[PDB]
Design an enzyme around this catalytic site. Structure first.
Site, PDB file in Angstrom:
ATOM      1  N   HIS D 104     -53.049 -37.256  -0.925  1.00 14.08           N
ATOM      2  CA  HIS D 104     -54.182 -38.071  -1.361  1.00 14.08           C
ATOM      3  C   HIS D 104     -55.494 -37.743  -0.641  1.00 14.08           C
ATOM      4  O   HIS D 104     -56.468 -38.488  -0.752  1.00 14.08           O
ATOM      5  CB  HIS D 104     -53.874 -39.579  -1.261  1.00 14.08           C
ATOM      6  CG  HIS D 104     -52.535 -39.971  -1.812  1.00 14.08           C
ATOM      7  ND1 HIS D 104     -51.369 -39.877  -1.074  1.00 14.08           N
ATOM      8  CD2 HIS D 104     -52.170 -40.469  -3.012  1.00 14.08           C
ATOM      9  CE1 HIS D 104     -50.351 -40.300  -1.795  1.00 14.08           C
ATOM     10  NE2 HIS D 104     -50.807 -40.659  -2.984  1.00 14.08           N
ATOM     11  N   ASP D 205     -26.494 -16.931  33.657  1.00 12.92           N
ATOM     12  CA  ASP D 205     -25.375 -16.063  33.312  1.00 12.92           C
ATOM     13  C   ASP D 205     -25.675 -14.588  33.554  1.00 12.92           C
ATOM     14  O   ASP D 205     -26.071 -13.861  32.637  1.00 12.92           O
ATOM     15  CB  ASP D 205     -24.985 -16.277  31.853  1.00 12.92           C
ATOM     16  CG  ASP D 205     -23.643 -15.671  31.503  1.00 12.92           C
ATOM     17  OD1 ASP D 205     -23.153 -14.786  32.237  1.00 12.92           O
ATOM     18  OD2 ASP D 205     -23.088 -16.065  30.452  1.00 12.92           O
ATOM     19  N   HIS D 208     -22.142 -12.141  32.397  1.00 13.31           N
ATOM     20  CA  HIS D 208     -21.902 -11.569  31.066  1.00 13.31           C
ATOM     21  C   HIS D 208     -22.557 -10.212  30.843  1.00 13.31           C
ATOM     22  O   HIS D 208     -22.166  -9.481  29.939  1.00 13.31           O
ATOM     23  CB  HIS D 208     -22.341 -12.541  29.956  1.00 13.31           C
ATOM     24  CG  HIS D 208     -23.788 -12.429  29.569  1.00 13.31           C
ATOM     25  ND1 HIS D 208     -24.819 -12.814  30.400  1.00 13.31           N
ATOM     26  CD2 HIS D 208     -24.369 -12.004  28.420  1.00 13.31           C
ATOM     27  CE1 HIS D 208     -25.976 -12.609  29.789  1.00 13.31           C
ATOM     28  NE2 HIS D 208     -25.728 -12.121  28.584  1.00 13.31           N
ATOM     29  N   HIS D 213     -23.338  -6.812  27.217  1.00  6.77           N
ATOM     30  CA  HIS D 213     -24.402  -5.864  26.910  1.00  6.77           C
ATOM     31  C   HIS D 213     -24.035  -4.420  27.246  1.00  6.77           C
ATOM     32  O   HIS D 213     -24.916  -3.573  27.385  1.00  6.77           O
ATOM     33  CB  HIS D 213     -25.711  -6.286  27.602  1.00  6.77           C
ATOM     34  CG  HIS D 213     -26.252  -7.596  27.113  1.00  6.77           C
ATOM     35  ND1 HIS D 213     -26.753  -7.765  25.844  1.00  6.77           N
ATOM     36  CD2 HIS D 213     -26.350  -8.803  27.722  1.00  6.77           C
ATOM     37  CE1 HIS D 213     -27.147  -9.018  25.688  1.00  6.77           C
ATOM     38  NE2 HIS D 213     -26.907  -9.670  26.813  1.00  6.77           N
ATOM     39  N   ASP D 362     -25.350 -10.844  21.956  1.00  8.78           N
ATOM     40  CA  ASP D 362     -25.032 -12.220  22.337  1.00  8.78           C
ATOM     41  C   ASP D 362     -24.623 -13.095  21.165  1.00  8.78           C
ATOM     42  O   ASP D 362     -24.064 -14.173  21.381  1.00  8.78           O
ATOM     43  CB  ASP D 362     -26.244 -12.888  23.001  1.00  8.78           C
ATOM     44  CG  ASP D 362     -26.575 -12.309  24.357  1.00  8.78           C
ATOM     45  OD1 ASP D 362     -25.746 -12.427  25.284  1.00  8.78           O
ATOM     46  OD2 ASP D 362     -27.695 -11.780  24.502  1.00  8.78           O
TER      47      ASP D 362
HETATM   48  O1  LIG Z   1     -30.107 -11.952  28.924  1.00  7.91           O
HETATM   49  C1  LIG Z   1     -29.874 -12.262  30.082  1.00  7.91           C
HETATM   50  C2  LIG Z   1     -29.345 -13.612  30.521  1.00  7.91           C
HETATM   51  C3  LIG Z   1     -29.174 -13.476  32.044  1.00  7.91           C
HETATM   52  C4  LIG Z   1     -29.655 -12.076  32.376  1.00  7.91           C
HETATM   53  C5  LIG Z   1     -29.709 -11.507  33.640  1.00  7.91           C
HETATM   54  C6  LIG Z   1     -30.188 -10.201  33.739  1.00  7.91           C
HETATM   55  C7  LIG Z   1     -30.596  -9.494  32.603  1.00  7.91           C
HETATM   56  C8  LIG Z   1     -30.536 -10.079  31.338  1.00  7.91           C
HETATM   57  C9  LIG Z   1     -30.056 -11.382  31.270  1.00  7.91           C
HETATM   58  S1  FES Z   2     -53.128 -38.749   2.103  1.00  8.01           S
HETATM   59 FE1  FES Z   2     -51.415 -39.779   1.217  1.00  8.01          FE
HETATM   60  S2  FES Z   2     -49.656 -38.846   2.144  1.00  8.01           S
HETATM   61 FE2  FES Z   2     -51.383 -37.944   3.121  1.00  8.01          FE
HETATM   62 FE   LIG Z   3     -27.007 -11.680  26.947  1.00  5.93          FE
END
Ligand SMILES: O=C1CCc2ccccc21
Ligand code: FES
Ligand SMILES: [Fe+3]
Ligand SMILES: O=C1CCc2ccccc21
Ligand SMILES: O=C1CCc2ccccc21
Ligand code: FES
Ligand code: FES
Ligand SMILES: [Fe+3]
Ligand SMILES: [Fe+3]
Lengths: 446, 192, 192, 446, 192, 446
Positions: D104, D205, D208, D213, D362
């Site tokens: 509106h 982490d 991992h 990786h 991941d």
């Molecule tokens: O992607 C990640 C999560 C933790 C981490 C530590 C070192 C390098 C990459 C990463």
């Molecule tokens: S002006 Fe009516 S919903 Fe935004």
């Molecule tokens: Fe990772």
């Protein structure tokens, strides 16, 4: 959520909690208190004119078979086999004396009766009580000038009483014009909006037209085109708004008989409507003859909407809190030349159908407004419908209902949501009536 | 095709098959492919005025229908079988193009993204109008907008194309019988 | 295309249209189709080394961008319009290929399944470098893995191909402006 | 589920119920107790530097408009119209003095004020109180060296206090380097994981990396590449882990300034970081200058993560218990040569963007770990984070926070989940504080 | 392709590549495209008897497999690698066609809607049987029914076609290795 | 919903509330009271014959690894890492001595034991108690003639007792034939039906065959083909129906050894089955030898079904109330010629596999019957299973179980749903037993 106590709609319908467009528990509650309780649009005589003709329709999330009986009446039944619950009919329309289930072959009549069971004698003997195995029947089926509505609740008011003050406004076009036909089949499209978003828009939203539909107004050259981009406000006396006890309401834009139709239909329509108006002056009086050829944007509570003269006819079939299946038909006057009816039907779909360029303008508005109702910081926020509050009247000598004597306002939102809240907080019709005994006073405060 | 034997085939579909199984002209298939690929390119980049000017004949009928679901055995119910999602002449297409280009078409900001895939091109000259070219093709149309809205359309197109101004072949009829009865794409606001 | 009239068309898109509406050579369109079909086949069977050796030029830029959503009327905000999902030279593509082929790429067991659909092929020689071939094509890429994961990608590709070692035409530039802003495919770890 | 009593995280953060990654009721509870309560990342000065510049951002499942004011401050507002709840802004970034609703036509200022209403005089007269109709404003918006965070809860600690002991580690890169810029626009991809899965992975982490990786380490030739396939364990003293009262934590890998960047950037980066480190020795001391050019994997509680030096910057935007929308930006040091910033930005996206080959490693880990939280036999199972428990310290003379003096462990998981549980079981900040008055003691037990 | 170097490539896939990288005949590619486009048209209009009569050889093997997911490093587990979703001779295809055409096939009312997109066509004559034509192509198959049911199938097809009655080229083998292990399309009751 | 009190299945199994096919809360309750309590099909010896062979399988919504041990036994374990909950195995079958997690590299044996943890000595020292970190093991794993079932509930009856009276009928084909093999891999397809819809259909629905499968009967020329379009009712004595205490049941169609197989296999099969029957007469008696070569449509409660002789073997794996993942294997007799086994396997998939033309006939029936259970007006409606009620016997001198001595009826529905209701309303096996102490009396009333 305690629906007895929760204020979802504030006093006088002035605001609503945004969660109403997003809350799935409330949607489930609406299946009971809105859709299983109220009158819902099914079909038109013109789509099932002969004995045996049938269509399928939604009533809330349920599907029904709507069938013309041999005696000329119409009965409707759940599209569900009484044996093990398979969907009986898989088509949208046809003609038959009965419906046979594709699972175990049970045969039901057009009258819902269980008429045959394969090998009944050898399998069930005389033990199957077929008299008690008829399709689950829609308790109430009534007509308003060919427009057929159904209601699951035996306790509902008659359809005519349910339309309340809105009936007076619809009658010139629905009755006194000689009658309308619904042109099928409908367009069918799913949108990601709550059913209430388009319902509220059609019932009382003239404010959005110039801005939302700026591009369609500018491009199509229709009769309401001066509104494009809010370039102009309609003059005083350009129209009015009304609402009623059971929630139905509409806007009236005086004389707008060509409606949203592009310039290619304007002269033909304006001649036709004007000519019939001159005849109707003598029959129903000048005011009502004028209403006949005036553009009505109406919602028949809860989820059936229309634009008379434009000829747009809508069902907002609920799927879940953010999903609605939109059915779009065209309405035409029976005594229009056939070639005009055909072009009018195409134009309804051109503007408001599945590829309706006007309807497309509304998509983002209704989808985002609905989806925002799920968002954490918006659930408890207040949607406003206070425009024109304190200027509505009831019991006017000329125009019945709760009426705002201006073309643009939120009168019809307030009546729609007052009825909605009264139903949501009630367990039956008697409770709705008790909750509505001062309905017009509440709406006309201040 | 004998449609009494091939029970699932409509008379219309059988008629359309016949027109392509006859005079196969490889060169015409290639011309048709170019014509449709260029048309799709103009539409994909939303050059709607260029599409009208270069691809669309003044006498065009641009039609997309939605057919009501009826029983395969149905023989009595004889009311309107279909509605028109589109049934546009040139001026009506122009209205739709102006609506797309209007700076107050709020739905077009941010700009939409279209990608069209045209396949299964067949072409045959009309028997009685040697200037009328029948072209059949299928389209997948992908529309992306507003971060995470994605709509994919699928259709077969029965076209007639004819040489117009400057000898340029232009669309004089497009017919689509849309295969999905209930749209799950928010709308059908795309040029198939 | 007049982009002052066709308001939705970008200057870049208008420039690209012009290059194909000029000298149409049917034979070149066919060569381009073969080139792209063979490229897609090598990728689909995950012959990534063969793809590098046979399809990819030493001077390649392989680029897929994601453009931030901005107002159609925007004229003031002038910061980086896009990021690079890919922007790889040959050595960077080789790193990605070795990553795919590494036996400790756990995500590639069980083996992925790829199916590519290449359509809308257009080809035109460069005006100033008669050894530079512009090829435009659209791709649907289907990736299936792990029983019930299915990801479908859709894109238009603006390529330049040039004759390299042994006279073999190889990709020297691919540019994709990815049409979906927020990916709904877990990642874009596919060669479009 | 009674969140006051339910032990979702065991004492000392040693384990968590697997259901936390899958339970939708808990996700809804997190919207209230995590996302509406805590500081969430919005944008950087570098993306909205001039008056009128704005971006949209998610805060939990809500969307906000974040706008540079004329006075140089930043204010943020719900992206929801105050009339009938339509989404106001549909783009991701731009420059404007205001935002007009397409429904509106209500016009809001960059300051959130309702500035104009179409035909206000004729429709509302003087009855509309626009002063009370401003956009719903994010209560708290603060900056950490250009990085802009928002919080819906007025009662939250200042951003600096909320960062707690983590701030000390971030300052060398965020402040003493001369400052960072965020390079946009971000990559955006939906993954089928709970937001906590990548949040916990980035916060603590390192375990991992060599295995998850392996292929990216082997293929990219980055500086941490000796870890590929667990071929080698980092030496003693290779790094440490930390965590803090309000849940933020990080790993520190000494000297790893080129991070995950492929060999093509290693010499250039190692020269640049080393040169700035030599300057910083004199300003902030050797240890902190070394931290500047050391790789930090950090989560700013709850759902903002980063890898400094690699330059990866992440928002894990929650959608539902098994759906997260991942936003990926690049961070660069302001005084880097522009060509280096450009290549660094591309490399961030190359490794961790939508087609980031590291990030792809991941996917299955985080998606399946999250989805398993829905599975019946796993809901009540215990996710383990006990590595290094009993060897953490607090109050160290050199390194602040709860600290594990080893490169690989689960110290930061424990602090993250201790804060998470304290929030989930609390109704407000005061209750969180009461539940956290012995936070470091709990973490250093045994 | 050296599959010891291109570690992700199967022996079968490498063999199939080789057959198309050899004698490229442009005319054959065009014949193949026509053949497959006409086949797809007959199937799309559900002219299943016409499809059998015009497209399918009496000695046909029509096969679609689903391969069990196994470790990329797997070398010991040696039980049935795949099952047959289809493995039909001519009579078995005829049974399926009669099942489609039967007036008591309740699932075919209301009538289904099919749209097929055929892309990436490659063709090569067999080396040892100069009457045997190898054709490779990819298909997207869209099936819509009952208002809101939509199923999309994606596949690569390895065909052999041979001249039969009246010199008409007909399908003598189709092999599809279906890329999705768990079907998300209710069934695979479509002719790929 | 209070599952202790709610009558979901009426006395004697005569009807069921339609909501059972649609209610998601009930589906969640079934995970506990049906799937975590009862015996579920895993695999066959023939698919994991050698030490180290494994497959993955679903048990309800959980996934398990099913592994052949060095000692020749089979153990099954949740496919979930004990560290941070990642899915351990991503393939469907193979051979290995262990499973290594791709997240942090923990290595589990085929026996479920945590055997290795990367850098355990340097990271955990001696602090990690690997003995307590074995994969979560399926408590019960038992075999019925090579067919391997699992149960999470240690309290369950032995598999043989659980099969109850159904075992007698299965033994001629499963045991006395010399044994069966399962031919893999299975077809896998998702259907939009509740798992109970195909389960009830296979357990006891002969009524549907002539009508549902009219087109497949007419087109395929199988031995049951006279039923097409209900053209003929099977003669008296054509078969019988049975059911049992723990819910398993089946139909028996005398002599139908070629089953649904098209005419191309009929002569070969009818010769083979007849020849083995003649041998079996002398070993197990004429009646049981006849049962061997008779077509059994059986459900092993809850969600494993089969058609003996046709050789169709099914798992209806539950996903949600309207989603089921259908696994389809072929069963063959071990001593059949290999070429016959191959053709039989292809024919099973031809008729009942992913592109099974018979199976396709059932799709709409099962999907719509299931989805209708969500519809408001149908939730509280009654699905009927009263065919043959009052004519069943128990304790017959020849045929054991609750038996209906007719080929077509609903005896097996009643026993299936009686057991279902007893489980849904019980907290454990002891309560099920108490609720089932008069099971056959309830089924044979009137
Ligand atoms: O992607 C990640 C999560 C933790 C981490 C530590 C070192 C390098 C990459 C990463
Ligand atoms: S002006 Fe009516 S919903 Fe935004
Ligand atoms: Fe990772
Ligand atoms: O579409 C709508 C809703 C209200 C309205 C009023 C006038 C014209 C069109 C419309
Ligand atoms: O598919 C089924 C279920 C019951 C049945 C009985 C006989 C033949 C087939 C079948
Ligand atoms: S479900 Fe309809 S006849 Fe059985
Ligand atoms: S989740 Fe499996 S080793 Fe960590
Ligand atoms: Fe509107
Ligand atoms: Fe069946």
């Amino acid at each position: 959520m305690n629906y007895n106590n929760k204020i979802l709609v504030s006093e006088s319908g002035l605001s609503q909690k945004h969660l109403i467009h997003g809350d799935e528990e409330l949607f489930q509650h609406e299946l009971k208190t809105i859709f299983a309780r109220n009158w819902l649009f099914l079909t038109h005589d013109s789509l099932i004119p002969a004995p045996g003709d049938y269509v399928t329709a939604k009533m809330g999330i349920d599907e029904v078979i709507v069938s013309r009986q041999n005696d000329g009446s119409i009965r409707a039944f759940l599209n569900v086999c009484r044996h093990r619950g398979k969907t009986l009919v898989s088509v949208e329309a046809g003609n038959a004396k009965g419906f046979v289930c594709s699972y175990h072959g049970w045969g039901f009549g057009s009258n819902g009766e269980l008429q045959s069971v394969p090998f009944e004698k050898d399998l069930y003997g005389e033990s199957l009580n077929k008299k008690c195995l008829g399709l689950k029947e829609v308790a109430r089926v009534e007509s308003f000038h060919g427009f057929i509505y159904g209601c699951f609740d035996q306790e509902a008011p008659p359809l005519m009483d349910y339309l309340g003050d809105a009936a007076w406004y619809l009658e010139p076009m629905f009755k006194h014009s000689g009658g309308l036909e619904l042109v099928g089949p409908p367009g069918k499209v799913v949108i990601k909006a709550n059913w209430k978003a388009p319902a509220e828009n059609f019932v009382g939203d003239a404010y959005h037209v110039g801005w939302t539909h700026a591009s369609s107004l500018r491009s199509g050259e229709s009769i309401f085109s001066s509104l494009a981009g809010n370039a102009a406000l309609p003059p005083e006396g350009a129209g009015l708004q009304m609402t009623s006890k059971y929630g139905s309401g509409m806007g009236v834009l005086w004389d707008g008989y060509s409606g949203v139709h592009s310039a290619d239909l304007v002269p033909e329509l304006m001649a036709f409507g004007g000519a019939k108006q001159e005849r109707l002056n003598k029959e129903i009086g000048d005011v009502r003859a004028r209403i006949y050829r005036s553009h009505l944007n109406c919602t028949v509570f809860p989820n059936n909407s229309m634009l008379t003269c434009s000829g747009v006819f809508k069902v907002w079939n609920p799927i879940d809190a953010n999903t609605t299946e939109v059915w779009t038909y065209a309405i035409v006057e029976k005594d229009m030349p056939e070639d005009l009816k055909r072009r009018l039907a195409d134009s309804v779909q051109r503007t408001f159908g599945p590829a309706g360029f006007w309807e497309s303008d509304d998509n983002d508005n209704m989808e985002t407004a609905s989806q925002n109702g799920k968002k954490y910081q918006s659930r408890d926020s207040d949607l406003l419908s206070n425009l024109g509050f304190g200027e509505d009247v009831y019991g006017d000598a000329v125009y019945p209902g709760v009426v705002g004597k201006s073309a643009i306002g939120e009168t019809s939102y307030r009546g729609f949501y007052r009825a909605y809240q009264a139903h949501v907080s009630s367990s039956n019709w008697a409770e709705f009536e008790h909750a509505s005994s001062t309905w017009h006073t509440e709406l006309t405060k201040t | 095709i004998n449609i009494q034997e091939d029970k699932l085939v409509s008379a219309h579909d059988a008629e359309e098959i016949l027109r392509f199984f006859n005079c196969h002209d490889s060169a015409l298939q290639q011309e048709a492919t170019t014509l449709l690929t260029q048309e799709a390119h103009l539409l994909d980049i939303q050059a709607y005025r260029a599409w009208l000017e270069h691809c669309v004949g003044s006498e065009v009928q641009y039609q997309v229908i939605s057919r009501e679901l009826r029983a395969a055995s149905e023989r009595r119910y004889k009311l309107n079988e279909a509605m028109n999602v589109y049934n546009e002449n040139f001026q009506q297409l122009k209205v739709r193009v102006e609506h797309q280009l209007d700076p107050q078409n709020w739905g077009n900001s941010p700009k939409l993204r279209f990608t069209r895939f045209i396949t299964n091109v067949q072409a045959a000259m009309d028997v009685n109008d040697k200037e009328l070219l029948h072209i059949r093709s299928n389209v997948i149309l992908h529309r992306a907008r507003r971060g995470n809205q994605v709509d994919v359309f699928y259709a077969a197109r029965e076209d007639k194309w004819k040489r117009g101004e400057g000898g340029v072949r232009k669309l004089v009829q497009r017919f689509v019988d849309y295969p999905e009865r209930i749209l799950q794409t928010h709308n059908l606001m795309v040029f198939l």
